[PDB]
């Protein structure tokens, strides 16, 4: 996770 929350969003997973 790149938000330090515990969940990866679409454009997020792209970075995770
Ligand atoms: La996140």
Swiss-Prot record:
PTM annotation (N6-acetyllysine): residues: 2
Subcellular location, record wording: Cytoplasm, Cytoskeleton, Spindle; Cytoplasm, Cytoskeleton, Spindle pole; Cytoplasm, Cytoskeleton, Microtubule organizing center, Centrosome; Cell projection, Cilium, Flagellum
Cysteines joined through disulfide linkages: none
Membrane-crossing segments per the record: none
Post-translational modification: Ubiquitination results in a strongly decreased activity. Phosphorylation results in a decreased activity.
Residues carrying Phosphoserine: 9
Binding site residues for Ca(2+) 3: 1, 3, 5, 7, 12
Residues making up the signal peptide according to the UniProt record: none
Phosphotyrosine carried by residues: 7
Assembly with partners or alone: Homotetramer. Interacts with MYO1C, MYO5A and RRAD. Interacts with MYO10. Interacts with CEP97, CCP110, TTN/titin and SRY. Interacts with USP6; the interaction is calcium dependent. Interacts with CDK5RAP2. Interacts with SCN5A. Interacts with RYR1. Interacts with FCHO1. Interacts with MIP in a 1:2 stoichiometry; the interaction with the cytoplasmic domains from two MIP subunits promotes MIP water channel closure. Interacts with ORAI1; this may play a role in the regulation of ORAI1-mediated calcium transport. Interacts with IQCF1. Interacts with SYT7.
Illness: Ventricular tachycardia, catecholaminergic polymorphic, 4: An arrhythmogenic disorder characterized by stress-induced, bidirectional ventricular tachycardia that may degenerate into cardiac arrest and cause sudden death. Patients present with recurrent syncope, seizures, or sudden death after physical activity or emotional stress. CPVT4 inheritance is autosomal dominant. Long QT syndrome 14: A form of long QT syndrome, a heart disorder characterized by a prolonged QT interval on the ECG and polymorphic ventricular arrhythmias. They cause syncope and sudden death in response to exercise or emotional stress, and can present with a sentinel event of sudden cardiac death in infancy.
Function: Calmodulin acts as part of a calcium signal transduction pathway by mediating the control of a large number of enzymes, ion channels, aquaporins and other proteins through calcium-binding. Calcium-binding is required for the activation of calmodulin. Among the enzymes to be stimulated by the calmodulin-calcium complex are a number of protein kinases, such as myosin light-chain kinases and calmodulin-dependent protein kinase type II (CaMK2), and phosphatases. (Microbial infection) Required for Legionella pneumophila SidJ glutamylase activity.
Free-text note on domains in this protein's UniProt record: The N-terminal and C-terminal lobes of CALM bind to the C-terminus of KCNQ1 in a clamp-like conformation. Binding of CALM C-terminus to KCNQ1 is calcium-independent but is essential for assembly of the structure. Binding of CALM N-terminus to KCNQ1 is calcium-dependent and regulates electrophysiological activity of the channel. The C-lobe interacts with KCNN4 channels in a calcium-independent manner, whereas the N-lobe interacts with the S4-S5 linker of KCNN4 in a calcium-dependent manner playing a role as calcium sensor and gating the channel.
Family statement drawn from the similarity comment of this UniProt entry: Belongs to the calmodulin family.
Additional remarks: This protein has four functional calcium-binding sites.
Protein name: Calmodulin-1
């Amino acid at each position: 996770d790149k938000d330090g929350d515990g969940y990866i969003s679409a454009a997020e997973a792209a970075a995770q």
